[PDB]
Amino acid sequence: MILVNRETRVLVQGITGREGQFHTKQMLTYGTKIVAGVTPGKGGMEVLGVPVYDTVKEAVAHHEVDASIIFVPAPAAADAALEAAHAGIPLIVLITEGIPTLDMVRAVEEIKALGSRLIGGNCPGIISAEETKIGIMPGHVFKRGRVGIISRSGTLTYEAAAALSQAGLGTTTTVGIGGDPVIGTTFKDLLPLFNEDPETEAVVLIGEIGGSDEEEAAAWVKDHMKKPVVGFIGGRVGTPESKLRAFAEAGIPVADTIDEIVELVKKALG
């Protein structure tokens, strides 16, 4: 696994909202160690046994936190991420969709400078199979195994994870990094972590049109990866052709279908 596991202590920002409450319940049931929640104006309340505070600073003053997950409304979501970073929280998972691009870029830059890792926004989060769940992904399709996943598409991530689980390969950590133009963590940032994780025997990269992250990741894989990588591009620099060419030139086998992801991983591991 990379980044998080069962021991990861989690803070939920926007815990009192409909989404926040629903997923706090799903995560608690999964085994995620949610230790506190934050919602301005709701400090003093309790959600599913989780104490709620008005600010992240107040929450961290009473609880050690390794990561935070944000369900705060779009207009204030970027600030919520910044609030977590200023409090010293190492990992910040920003779920919220619709955050203004300008807000997003400013948050990415400042949080990066502060030393925290930001996943998102507009993403499903991170899950370490049968260890911990810090996101909104369907937990049941992530059976524990040996394949790591980094994906810009939640849709394809779940199809791939379910297929890998059914094939007996399973998964380690899956990070849904988000498909929007501006994201805080991408392929190249996570590949080195998977490369050094002995539990991960192969990594699946799921990309799509736009940006240059897939192309940059391919170059990194070609020069530094020590284990198999399989790629998939949805919607079949910045074009699908450019990304397919980049993967091909990097020696990264590309699956044309979800089933081929499974077949290519099996082939690579022998």
UniProtKB/Swiss-Prot annotation:
It holds the Pfam family CoA_binding. GO terms for molecular function: nucleotide binding; succinate-CoA ligase (ADP-forming) activity; succinate-CoA ligase (GDP-forming) activity. Its EC number is 6.2.1.4. It catalyses: GTP + succinate + CoA = succinyl-CoA + GDP + phosphate; succinate + ATP + CoA = succinyl-CoA + ADP + phosphate. It is an enzyme of class 6 (ligase). The keyword Nucleotide-binding applies. Pathway: Carbohydrate metabolism; tricarboxylic acid cycle; succinate from succinyl-CoA (ligase route): step 1/1. GO terms for biological process: tricarboxylic acid cycle. Optimum pH is 8.0-8.4. One of its GO terms (cellular component) is succinate-CoA ligase complex (ADP-forming). The keyword Nucleotide-binding applies. CoA binds at residues 16-19, 42, 95-97. Heterotetramer of two alpha and two beta subunits. NCBIfam families: PRK05678.1, sucCoAalpha. Succinyl-CoA synthetase functions in the citric acid cycle (TCA), coupling the hydrolysis of succinyl-CoA to the synthesis of either ATP or GTP and thus represents the only step of substrate-level phosphorylation in the TCA. The alpha subunit of the enzyme binds the substrates coenzyme A and phosphate, while succinate binding and nucleotide specificity is provided by the beta subunit. Can use either ATP or GTP, but prefers GTP. This is Succinate--CoA ligase [GDP-forming] subunit alpha. It comes from Thermus thermophilus. The lineage of its organism: Bacteria, Thermotogati, Deinococcota, Deinococci, Thermales. The gene is sucD.
